């Protein structure tokens, strides 16, 4: 049967190309910590892209050690709802 | 993690059937997720607190219904073989999605293996990950969401500047 070669991928990097990503010895990676937090709060009602966008929104204000997580090489054709508990 | 009520699950499946990925019921479901993390390197700085990212991501993915495979301290070739091994798991046929979490030091176009250095590059290109898991080489995950989470530097430059490191903070 006929099918695409590449489809249904999405990548969420911790920062932009060419740039450093930071990590706390006492808490782990800032990006991973924010990602888990947004998932715990919003996975029950938001699809994956909106969750990622909320993570990106939490990094909008520039800090002294700024990161900007980016969505990359995304070929999702539908909304990805996780329906936690179902 | 607060759960989605069954009434909302049936509501979204009725209102937006064509617009959302189909979610398999948790009965005969075998969701698999892969975590690859490198902490100790031959030449690079030890990634203190990387264990704080493993269990948190492993606990999150488990709360989401995924069985989490954790592989640590791998070279670039080690990462590639573990990914090919994970991509061929028969459990993907009875799954609806997968998560791929990669955490290590990083380069512009790849993630570093344990042996990486300026003189001894040990890098797995992110482009190779897509080849391993695309519709050609991963039949179990065809038409199913494949989410890639990457915690790593993408270069050596700072991500901020002024327009007209701290002791507990490290760089990947």
Curated annotation (Swiss-Prot), chain A:
Heterotetramer that consists of two anti-parallel arranged heterodimers, each one formed by a 20 kDa (Caspase-4 subunit p20) and a 10 kDa (Caspase-4 subunit p10) subunit. It comes from the Eukaryota. Changing residue 23 to A: Abolished ability to cleave Gasdermin-D (GSDMD). The modification (Microbial infection) ADP-riboxanated arginine is found at residue 23. This is Caspase-4 subunit p10.
């Amino acid at each position: 049967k006929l099918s695409h070669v590449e489809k249904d991928f999405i990548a969420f990097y911790s920062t932009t190309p060419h740039h450093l990503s930071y990590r706390d010895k006492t808490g782990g990676s800032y990006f991973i910590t924010r990602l888990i937090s947004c998932f715990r709060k919003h996975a029950c009602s938001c699809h994956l892209f909106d969750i990622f966008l909320k993570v990106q929104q939490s990094f909008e204000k520039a800090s002294i050690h700024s990161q900007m997580p980016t969505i990359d090489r995304a070929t999702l054709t539908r909304y990805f709802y996780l329906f936690p508990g179902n | 993690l607060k759960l989605c009520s069954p009434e909302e699950f049936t509501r979204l499946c009725r209102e937006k059937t064509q617009e959302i990925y189909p979610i398999k019921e948790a009965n005969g479901r075998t969701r698999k997720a892969l975590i690859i993390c490198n902490t100790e390197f031959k030449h690079l700085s030890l990634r203190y607190g990387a264990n704080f990212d493993i269990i948190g991501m492993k606990g999150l993915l488990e709360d989401l219904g995924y069985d989490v495979v954790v592989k640590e301290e791998l070279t670039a070739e080690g990462m590639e073989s573990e990914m090919k091994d994970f991509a061929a798991l028969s459990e993907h046929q009875t799954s609806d999605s997968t998560f791929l979490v990669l955490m290590s030091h990083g380069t512009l176009h790849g993630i570093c293996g344990t042996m990486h250095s300026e003189k001894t590059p040990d890098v797995l290109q992110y482009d190779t990950i897509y080849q391993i898991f695309n519709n050609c080489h991963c039949p179990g995950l065809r038409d199913k969401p494949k989410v890639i989470i990457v915690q790593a530097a993408r270069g050596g430059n700072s991500g901020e500047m002024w327009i007209r490191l701290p002791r507990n903070m490290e760089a990947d």
